[PDB]
Design a protein around this ligand. Structure first.
Ligand SMILES: CC(C)CCC[C@@H](C)[C@H]1CC[C@H]2[C@@H]3CC=C4C[C@@H](OC(=O)CCC(=O)O)CC[C@]4(C)[C@H]3CC[C@]12C
Ligand SMILES: CC(C)CCC[C@@H](C)[C@H]1CC[C@H]2[C@@H]3CC=C4C[C@@H](OC(=O)CCC(=O)O)CC[C@]4(C)[C@H]3CC[C@]12C
Ligand SMILES: CC(C)CCC[C@@H](C)[C@H]1CC[C@H]2[C@@H]3CC=C4C[C@@H](OC(=O)CCC(=O)O)CC[C@]4(C)[C@H]3CC[C@]12C
Ligand SMILES: CC(C)CCC[C@@H](C)[C@H]1CC[C@H]2[C@@H]3CC=C4C[C@@H](OC(=O)CCC(=O)O)CC[C@]4(C)[C@H]3CC[C@]12C
Ligand SMILES: *[C@@H]1O[C@H](CO)[C@@H](O)[C@H](O)[C@H]1NC(C)=O
Ligand SMILES: *[C@@H]1O[C@H](CO)[C@@H](O)[C@H](O)[C@H]1NC(C)=O
Ligand SMILES: *[C@@H]1O[C@H](CO)[C@@H](O)[C@H](O)[C@H]1NC(C)=O
Ligand SMILES: [Cl-]
Ligand code: NA
Ligand code: NA
Length: 525
């Protein structure tokens, strides 16, 4: 009928391979682990992984396969009254795309700036450089006032790319080059969606192999760098005392729900095209193992780079980097300078970032569009109308993202990254999914359908995880965060005014309130 299906299982595998693999495995994980002490981030990370990450991902895949519907419509046949989880997921992904494409815009700016003989961030002698700047090579000299010194890479990222304002209360003026880069990326996405240009043919081999080969050579270079042992020890060995703060637990619980693309309506859409009699269990387990291994292995390379930088700069590891949403843009551009012929490797690395980010970008944008289409199949899922819908959505998203390319858009970006598609809202959605599935629908009723589909009956390692481990963890993290409140501080120094915190809380509540509002609306009818 109108609903189409995958031509072969290889399409599903290659779709998921780019959909939850991208910037969240090599960009968000490093500074999230770096800010929260280091090794202490891993214990709650693995606990949340084996407690809810694979279980909820597999549950979403099974609901998609068993319902043959999108993010919003599956809950209509699962539990009509507890609908609104799909609406919250759509809100989360809509707010996520806006600031997710800004990273791609920064990558495009870096790639365009890479097209000359000398990389601009290698040295600091330009107009934007402070008199405080000097090269990292000579920073450790006893002659060279050891607190006000700064590295060329940090100054470049702070002024040339960002032009950081004193605070969110001074937006400044708009930057036109960043707006052009954002428009270019949005045009590329629109052309890749409108004409259906995708990874179909022999190009999939390159599209899948090249990022992993680049990651492997990056890891080899990082592990070869001196001072990597200190970075590895910082990354692995935990601190027991830091475990008493809710921030580490809530960051670890959010990396599992973010990198795996959970609670945003993409996995159910991807599983909606699968075959009824298809063994999704083994494929889902293998893909989850691949994703977790990707995050874990990229952590080794990036923390070895951080350890080398801390060793060369003469300072400690915890105060050698930006420790915010832009740690990768200091860590990796510093790494590509050591490799022979730096320009070629820089171009390759930025193309690799663009590829990993874009395939996911397309995945979640298409998931959002399909979820919206499933609500109105008559007025959408059409020709020119479906074109103008995507065009209007892209234009609105570009206009909204224009607010983060000004001189004071870094604070807005950090606020979005903390309150938009992560934190309390993700725990809210995951709890309300696992609770309903385990208690109202029934965990034993789903095993019968699973046996009908995959052929055999799985074990109880997941029926208990959907019913006990996940709700307890979600409620505990929520209560612990509420009891001990610590305000957000960008780069440990900036103090956000009360109105900014209220704006962030309103951003989070816009997604959180969907469930109670839908419940009361349905009960009123
Ligand atoms: C505004 C910020 C927080 C970003 C969120 C944007 C979207 C996720 C929102 C904005 C407007 C919402 C729409 C507003 C009105 C409706 C009509 C509503 O229709 C009904 O009440 C059901 C009718 C029926 O049963 O046919 C269905 C949800 C929908 C499409 C909403 C879906 C979610 C939308 C697109
Ligand atoms: C409803 C959600 C989806 C969007 C809400 C608006 C946001 C896009 C935020 C991001 C940056 C914010 C702005 C950041 C800085 C300022 C300056 C602040 O004070 C000034 O106007 C300073 C003097 C001047 O800028 O002329 C007033 C609020 C405002 C415009 C903020 C209004 C709300 C903005 C546009
Ligand atoms: C806050 C930012 C991030 C939102 C960016 C995307 C929106 C501009 C898009 C996303 C989903 C869109 C909606 C998806 C589906 C429909 C149903 C369809 O209904 C109509 O033809 C009119 C409905 C009405 O009068 O509300 C077209 C409008 C609407 C609400 C769309 C309006 C524009 C929306 C909210
Ligand atoms: C602008 C700033 C302050 C952010 C807050 C925006 C909210 C006022 C918006 C954002 C998303 C909206 C929701 C998007 C989708 C829906 C689904 C829509 O359809 C139903 O749930 C009706 C179901 C039925 O009637 O059978 C009802 C409105 C609602 C909850 C919307 C209510 C208003 C919300 C929460
Ligand atoms: C820095 O620029 C000044 C101004 O032209 C020049 O005299 C100096 O040699 C430059 N130094 C380096 C290390 O590039
Ligand atoms: C420190 O400065 C002196 C100045 O003569 C120079 O000889 C020395 O090489 C510098 N140290 C390093 C590690 O380059
Ligand atoms: C950095 O050192 C001190 C910091 O106490 C500062 O007063 C001084 O002006 C700075 N000097 C240089 C050369 O940057
Ligand atoms: Cl991860
Ligand atoms: Na990807
Ligand atoms: Na991921």
């Amino acid at each position: 009928p109108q609903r189409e299906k995958w031509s072969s299982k290889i399409d599903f595998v290659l779709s998921v391979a780019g959909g939850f693999v991208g910037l969240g495995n090599v960009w968000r994980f490093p500074y999230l682990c770096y800010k929260n002490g280091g090794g202490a981030f891993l214990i709650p990370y693995f606990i949340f992984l084996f407690g809810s990450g694979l279980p909820v991902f597999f549950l979403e895949i099974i609901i998609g396969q068993y319902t043959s519907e999108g993010g919003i419509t599956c809950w209509e046949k699962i539990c009509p009254l507890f609908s609104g989880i799909g609406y919250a997921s759509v809100v989360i992904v809509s707010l996520l795309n806006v600031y997710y494409i800004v990273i791609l815009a920064w990558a495009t700016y870096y790639l365009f700036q890479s097209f000359q003989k000398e990389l601009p961030w290698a040295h600091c002698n330009h107009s934007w450089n402070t008199p405080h700047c000097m090269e990292d090579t000579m920073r450790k000299n006893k002659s060279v006032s050891s607190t006000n010194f700064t590295s060329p890479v940090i100054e470049f990222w702070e002024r040339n790319v960002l032009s950081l304002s004193p605070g969110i209360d001074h937006p400044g003026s708009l930057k036109w080059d960043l707006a052009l880069c954002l428009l270019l990326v949005w045009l590329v996405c629109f052309f890749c969606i409108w004409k259906g240009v995708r990874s179909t043919g022999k190009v999939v081999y390159f599209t899948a192999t090249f990022p992993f080969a680049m990651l492997l050579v990056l890891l080899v270079r990082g592990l070869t760098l001196p001072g990597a042992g200190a970075g590895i020890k910082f990354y692995l060995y935990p601190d027991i005392t830091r475990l008493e703060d809710p921030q580490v637990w809530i960051d670890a619980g959010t990396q599992i729900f973010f990198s795996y693309a959970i609670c945003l309506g993409a996995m159910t859409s991807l599983g909606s095209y699968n075959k009824y009699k298809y063994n999704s269990y083994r494929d889902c387990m293998l893909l989850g193992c691949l994703n977790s291994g990707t995050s874990f292995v990229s952590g080794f390379a990036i923390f070895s780079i951080l350890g080398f930088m801390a060793q060369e700069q003469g300072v400690d590891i915890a105060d050698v980097a930006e420790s915010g949403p832009g740690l990768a843009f200091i860590a990796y551009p510093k790494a590509v300078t050591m490799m022979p012929l730096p320009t070629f490797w820089s171009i390759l690395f930025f193309i690799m970032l663009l590829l990993l980010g874009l395939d996911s970008q397309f995945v979640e944008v298409e998931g959002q569009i399909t979820s919206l289409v499933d609500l109105y199949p008559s007025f959408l899922r059409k020709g020119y109308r479906r074109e103008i819908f995507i065009a209007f959505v892209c234009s609105i998203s570009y206009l909204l993202g224009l607010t983060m390319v000004t001189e004071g858009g870094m604070y807005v970006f950090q606020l979005f990254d903390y309150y938009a598609a992560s934190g309390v809202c993700l725990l809210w959605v995951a709890f309300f999914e696992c609770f309903v599935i385990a208690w109202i629908y029934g965990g034993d009723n789903l095993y019968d359908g699973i046996e009908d589909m995959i052929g055999y009956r799985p074990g109880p390692w997941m029926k208990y995880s959907w019913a006990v481990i996940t709700p307890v963890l979600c409620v505990g993290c929520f209560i612990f965060s509420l009891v001990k409140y610590v305000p957000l501080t960008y780069n440990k120094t900036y103090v956000y005014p009360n109105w900014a915190i209220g704006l962030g809380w309103s951003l989070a509540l816009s997604s959180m309130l969907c469930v109670p509002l839908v419940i009361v609306i349905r009960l009123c009818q």
